[PDB]
Amino acid sequence: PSVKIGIIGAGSAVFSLRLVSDLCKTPGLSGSTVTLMDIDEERLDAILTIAKKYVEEVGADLKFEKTMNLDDVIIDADFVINTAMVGGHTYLEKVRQIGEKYGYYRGIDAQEFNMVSDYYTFSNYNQLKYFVDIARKIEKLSPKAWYLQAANPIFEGTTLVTRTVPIKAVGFCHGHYGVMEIVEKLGLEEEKVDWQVAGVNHGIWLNRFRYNGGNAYPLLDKWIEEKSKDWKPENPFNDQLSPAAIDMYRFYGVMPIGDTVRNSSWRYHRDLETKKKWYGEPWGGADSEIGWKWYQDTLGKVTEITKKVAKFIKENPSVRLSDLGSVLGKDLSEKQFVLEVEKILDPERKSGEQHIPFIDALLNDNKARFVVNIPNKGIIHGIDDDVVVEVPALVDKNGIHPEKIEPPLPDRVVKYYLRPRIMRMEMALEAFLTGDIRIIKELLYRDPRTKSDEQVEKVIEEILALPENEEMRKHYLK
Amino acid sequence: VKIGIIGAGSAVFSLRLVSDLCKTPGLSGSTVTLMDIDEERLDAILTIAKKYVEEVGADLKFEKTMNLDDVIIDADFVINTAMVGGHTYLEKVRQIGEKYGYYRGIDAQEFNMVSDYYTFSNYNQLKYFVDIARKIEKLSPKAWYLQAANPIFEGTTLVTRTVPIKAVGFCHGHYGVMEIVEKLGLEEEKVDWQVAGVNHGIWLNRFRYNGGNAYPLLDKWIEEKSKDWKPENPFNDQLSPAAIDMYRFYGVMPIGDTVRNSSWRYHRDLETKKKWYGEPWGGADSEIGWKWYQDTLGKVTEITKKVAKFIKENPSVRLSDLGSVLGKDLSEKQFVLEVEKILDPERKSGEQHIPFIDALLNDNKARFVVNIPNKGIIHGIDDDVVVEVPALVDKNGIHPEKIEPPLPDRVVKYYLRPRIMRMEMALEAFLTGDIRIIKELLYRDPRTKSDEQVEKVIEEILALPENEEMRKHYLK
Ligand SMILES: NC(=O)c1ccc[n+]([C@@H]2O[C@H](COP(=O)([O-])OP(=O)(O)OC[C@H]3O[C@@H](n4cnc5c(N)ncnc54)[C@H](O)[C@@H]3O)[C@@H](O)[C@H]2O)c1
Numbered sequence: 001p002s003v004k005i006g007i008i009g010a011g012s013a014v015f016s017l018r019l020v021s022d023l024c025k026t027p028g029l030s031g032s033t034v035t036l037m038d039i040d041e042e043r044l045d046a047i048l049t050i051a052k053k054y055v056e057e058v059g060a061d062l063k064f065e066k067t068m069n070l071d072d073v074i075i076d077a078d079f080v081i082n083t084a085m086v087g088g089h090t091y092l093e094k095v096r097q098i099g100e101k102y103g104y105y106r107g108i109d110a111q112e113f114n115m116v117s118d119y120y121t122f123s124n125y126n127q128l129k130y131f132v133d134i135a136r137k138i139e140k141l142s143p144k145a146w147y148l149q150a151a152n153p154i155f156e157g158t159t160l161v162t163r164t165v166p167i168k169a170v171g172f173c174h175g176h177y178g179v180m181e182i183v184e185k186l187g188l189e190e191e192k193v194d195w196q197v198a199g200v201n202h203g204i205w206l207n208r209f210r211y212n213g214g215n216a217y218p219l220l221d222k223w224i225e226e227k228s229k230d231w232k233p234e235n236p237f238n239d240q241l242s243p244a245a246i247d248m249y250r251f252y253g254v255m256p257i258g259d260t261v262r263n264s265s266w267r268y269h270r271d272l273e274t275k276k277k278w279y280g281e282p283w284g285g286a287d288s289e290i291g292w293k294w295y296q297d298t299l300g301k302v303t304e305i306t307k308k309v310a311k312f313i314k315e316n317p318s319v320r321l322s323d324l325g326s327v328l329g330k331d332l333s334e335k336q337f338v339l340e341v342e343k344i345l346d347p348e349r350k351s352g353e354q355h356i357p358f359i360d361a362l363l364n365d366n367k368a369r370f371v372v373n374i375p376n377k378g379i380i381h382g383i384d385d386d387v388v389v390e391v392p393a394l395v396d397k398n399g400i401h402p403e404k405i406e407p408p409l410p411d412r413v414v415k416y417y418l419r420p421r422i423m424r425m426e427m428a429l430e431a432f433l434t435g436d437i438r439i440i441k442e443l444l445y446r447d448p449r450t451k452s453d454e455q456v457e458k459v460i461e462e463i464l465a466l467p468e469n470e471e472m473r474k475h476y477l478k
Numbered sequence: 479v480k481i482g483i484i485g486a487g488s489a490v491f492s493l494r495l496v497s498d499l500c501k502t503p504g505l506s507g508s509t510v511t512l513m514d515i516d517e518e519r520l521d522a523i524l525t526i527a528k529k530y531v532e533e534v535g536a537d538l539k540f541e542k543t544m545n546l547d548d549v550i551i552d553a554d555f556v557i558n559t560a561m562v563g564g565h566t567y568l569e570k571v572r573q574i575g576e577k578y579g580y581y582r583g584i585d586a587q588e589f590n591m592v593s594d595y596y597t598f599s600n601y602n603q604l605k606y607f608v609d610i611a612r613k614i615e616k617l618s619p620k621a622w623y624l625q626a627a628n629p630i631f632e633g634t635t636l637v638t639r640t641v642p643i644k645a646v647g648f649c650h651g652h653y654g655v656m657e658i659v660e661k662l663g664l665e666e667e668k669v670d671w672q673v674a675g676v677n678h679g680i681w682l683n684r685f686r687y688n689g690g691n692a693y694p695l696l697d698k699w700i701e702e703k704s705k706d707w708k709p710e711n712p713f714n715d716q717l718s719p720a721a722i723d724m725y726r727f728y729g730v731m732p733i734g735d736t737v738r739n740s741s742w743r744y745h746r747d748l749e750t751k752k753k754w755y756g757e758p759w760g761g762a763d764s765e766i767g768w769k770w771y772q773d774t775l776g777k778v779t780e781i782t783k784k785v786a787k788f789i790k791e792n793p794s795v796r797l798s799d800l801g802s803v804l805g806k807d808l809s810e811k812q813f814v815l816e817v818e819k820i821l822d823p824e825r826k827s828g829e830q831h832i833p834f835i836d837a838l839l840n841d842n843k844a845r846f847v848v849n850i851p852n853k854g855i856i857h858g859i860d861d862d863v864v865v866e867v868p869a870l871v872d873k874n875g876i877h878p879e880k881i882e883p884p885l886p887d888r889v890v891k892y893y894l895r896p897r898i899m900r901m902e903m904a905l906e907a908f909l910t911g912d913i914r915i916i917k918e919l920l921y922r923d924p925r926t927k928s929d930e931q932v933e934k935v936i937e938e939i940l941a942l943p944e945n946e947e948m949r950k951h952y953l954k
């Protein structure tokens with residue numbers, strides 16, 4: 001039979017096309033039916049146009065279905081992948097501005113160890129509620145389907161779903177590929193490196209880093225001593241080897257990986273100039289207003305180009321996606337988009353997203369190593385059983401088999417980084433589940449940016465008064 | 479039985495143990511060795527102590543020593559009430575912190591506002607706890623180490639994790655329960671209560687009366703009488719707005735010093751302290767309230783020196799008759815009465831050290847609130863973190879109570895865990911000598927504005943003359 005895979009938030013083109021192309025490149029999953037769902041009809045139609053073109057151009061037999069309805073993407077599904085962001089970037093920025101208006105630089109959701117700009121955990125009640133609503137619908141309509149959480153917040157979200165809805169659920173992220181930048185900068189062969197990461201999503205550490213039967217951190221130490229002085233970031237997100245990362249490594253004893261670097265204490269984020277010092281010129285990292293605008297702009301351009309490409313495919317039914325950049329111009333935006341298209345068109349190249357390989361491991365026993373977000377259940381020492389952690393695991397027809405963490409994470413990481421980060425995840429979930437507004441007020445009473453009780457009352461009142469937050473306000477009413 | 483007391487110059491503490499020892503028939507015949515480095519305060523307490531013993535006719539031998547080894551050898555119990563550096567060092571360091579923008583000093587942290595409860599700048603104090611403990615292990619391995627000196631939480635956790643001797647911490651904070659009982663008008667013998675947490679971080683997890691939940695009675699009091707509440711002194715904050723507010727969030731009442739140990743919300747500035755802890759002092763941890771307390775300490779020491787002098791000037795006179803020889807001088811007669819008041823207050827002191835010793839040696843069993851390694855008593859806390867919980871003590875030792883109902887999750891997750899993390903920082907800095915731990919505490923402090931501020935406040939504290947070994951310890 002045809003494996004049914006549903007994608008919520010399918011309008012996110014690059015992601016959907018990566019999943020679609022990976023499926024086409026996976027023998028055991030050929031013939032699958034992909035239901036694409038979104039609330040934005042234009043973005044939805046655009047991805048359907050491009051995905052259908054792709055499948056035909058490459059000779060695949062993948063079938064598609066379109067819907068704007070949650071029930072249709074879930075009914076009969078074997079896997080449900082959620083990449084939706086309720087409220088979009090417009091909601092994120094309106095809230096951030098309200099925060100800054102009341103003295104909270106970068107918004108109230110930016111907290112010690114969670115500076116990632118689109119990783120809201122308190123003001124995005126609607127996003128958290130959608131995760132739960134999807135999970136409950138899966139429980140009711142397709143009880144044996146897997147819920148694959150791709151949207152942020154992955155840590156809070158996956159913990160919330162696994163603790164409250166009895167379905168199979170896992171979160172997936174690309175964060176760990178930061179390991180590959182370190183390996184390449186040290187001139188080491190990836191296949192010769194024995195690595196392991198552990199922590200929570202966007203809060204992971206390189207607990208094991210060996211090369212040729214020995215601890216390889218000395219090689220990183222050599223790189224820091226001899227070459228870090230010449231280090232420069234290529235874009236706002238290129239901070240794996242920034243002063244912030246190195247300094248965290250020096251204190252904790254292991255390297256923070258990926259977005260974990262952005263998720264430092266307030267020390268590296270007191271102001272723009274401080275951000276530039278730790279994350280590099282000219283942006284001050286992805287989470288400054290400069291760096292975040294850089295990001296928002298690239299996203300806008302990607303959506304523009306997708307819409308253009310879709311339009312053109314419909315008007316020029318004979319054009320081939322491989323005739324890319326003959327239709328598209330040559331500005332940075334377009335050239336990058338063509339590189340992406342070429343990678344998805346290459347039959348021997350997988351995208352790197354873990355969703356499809358995960359499905360193939362489970363259904364066809366093509367086992368592989370994954371970095372997954374699952375309930376801890378003792379994997380990481382010192383963390384509660386029901387806290388979702390991000391760790392490596394072998395996955396096969398018999399399911400997810402967590403690796404043993406070794407060497408274990410250093411005590412400093414567990415005691416001084418993960419524990420406070422978990423405490424704020426616990427507050428976010430307790431506020432969400434109980435509707436007790438004093439949990440959110442407590443988070444702000446302890447926030448270093450808070451100067452008075454009036455400030456806390458006002459920022460909360462304004463966020464709860466936004467039109468899209470009517471049910472959130474009622475949920476929090478005493 | 480030999481009992482050694484380190485820091486015996488701590489007048490109130492010493493005279494209260496003297497008084498209780500005299501009233502404990504089971505410990506008659508005991509030898510008490512008083513030790514301090516301040517010869518003057520030491521002689522005064524020894525002079526008053528022997529004079530009191532004579533008076534009431536108790537059978538106790540009191541001696542003094544300025545030597546740590548002598549107070550420990552042959553001892554069955556070693557009680558530490560000493561504060562290395564004294565209040566002088568405390569204020570010296572606090573002034574430095576404030577110079578660099580840390581109101582009330584860098585040791586004032588979320589959930590640890592108690593002004594004399596230093597945990598990072600008082601390296602010398604922490605090292606003494608360990609030095610005392612190692613000597614006990616060396617010289618009198620079977621002695622019990624009883625810690626009265628602060629910080630009890632960090633200190634007792636430090637000692638129990640590193641030295642294999644019997645150690646327990648004792649405090650009087652839990653008595654806040656009695657104030658609640660009295661204000662609600664309840665018969666004490668009908669109240670079934672329990673507290674649990676860490677030292678100066680305990681909560682009334684159980685509060686029942688005649689078998690039913692008694693919190694509704696506190697709710698009644700809050701709703702009908704709190705608006706008329708006013709504190710009698712800077713420390714009288716058990717039923718303050720701060721306490722009530724913590725109770726409303728956490729679900730259980732914070733007890734004793736726990737009330738002082740709130741988040742920065744109630745301590746942003748003096749006016750905020752007044753709002754939460756009451757007029758006119760703003761609690762014991764404002765500059766006004768703390769000064770009020772410092773004044774009481776100075777007064778007590780002056781009193782004991784004046785009286786010790788009179789005792790020597792009038793060798794044949796009994797303590798209770800000393801006023802009789804000071805003639806028309808009411809001030810001097812009042813000094814003697816002041817001292818007698820310390821020895822025999824109108825209401826019992828409640829100090830647990832003597833009862834504890836009597837419980838262990840003579841099996842005169844009782845309920846105590848002790849600081850001991852957790853070992854699963856409080857769920858969610860590591861086995862080697864020292865907690866403050868109730869226990870039955872008898873000939874067979876300490877018998878911890880089962881905590882029931884358990885502390886609410888909010889208390890464990892949002893109060894104890896962060897508090898414990900800072901205890902872990904304090905201990906790691908002390909044990910490893912890695913100054914980056916102390917810098918990390920300050921990088922996260924809401925009062926910190928820059929790296930240079932952190933470097934300089936730490937450098938100045940490390941450059942004090944009393945801190946040469948501390949500076950050496952944190953080097954490299
Ligand atoms: N931007 C990225 O490349 C990226 C990478 C990794 C993870 N994520 C996470 O994925 C989520 C979305 O990513 P984004 O930045 O492209 O945001 P986005 O606003 O573009 O959301 C993407 C898709 O979600 C759809 N959507 C919104 N509300 C929906 C609803 N109620 N039901 C179904 N679909 C809905 C949108 O219309 C859109 O097509 C966020 O939580 C984000 O943090 C994004």
Ligand SMILES: NC(=O)c1ccc[n+]([C@@H]2O[C@H](COP(=O)([O-])OP(=O)(O)OC[C@H]3O[C@@H](n4cnc5c(N)ncnc54)[C@H](O)[C@@H]3O)[C@@H](O)[C@H]2O)c1
Pocket residue numbers: 484485486487488489513514515516519559560561562563564565594595606625626627628629648649650651775
């Ligand atoms: N557990 C409780 O119930 C409780 C109650 C009040 C105070 N305290 C604690 O008791 C300690 C002292 O209280 P205090 O206000 O009297 O302080 P203090 O400094 O005035 O007196 C303590 C005594 O320590 C002595 N001392 C200093 N260094 C010494 C050393 N190296 N060896 C021996 N003795 C030494 C002093 O000379 C002094 O007589 C502090 O840590 C304080 O926080 C605890």
Ligand SMILES: OC[C@H]1O[C@H](O[C@H]2[C@H](O)[C@@H](O)[C@@H](O)O[C@@H]2CO)[C@H](O)[C@@H](O)[C@@H]1O
Pocket residue numbers: 116117118152174175237258259286
């Ligand atoms: O905060 C935005 C987005 O950032 C991260 O993803 C980055 C990734 O780290 C970069 O290496 C590059 O691949 O672009 C990504 C965004 O396209 C977070 O991992 C992600 O969750 C977050 O939404």
Ligand SMILES: OC[C@H]1O[C@H](O[C@H]2[C@H](O)[C@@H](O)[C@@H](O)O[C@@H]2CO)[C@H](O)[C@@H](O)[C@@H]1O
Pocket residue numbers: 592593594628649650651713734735762
């Ligand atoms: O911070 C000084 C001192 O305060 C507390 O002791 C109080 C006690 O709680 C009161 O009940 C009353 O007895 O006065 C004491 C001060 O004399 C702390 O409990 C103690 O540890 C601390 O040193």
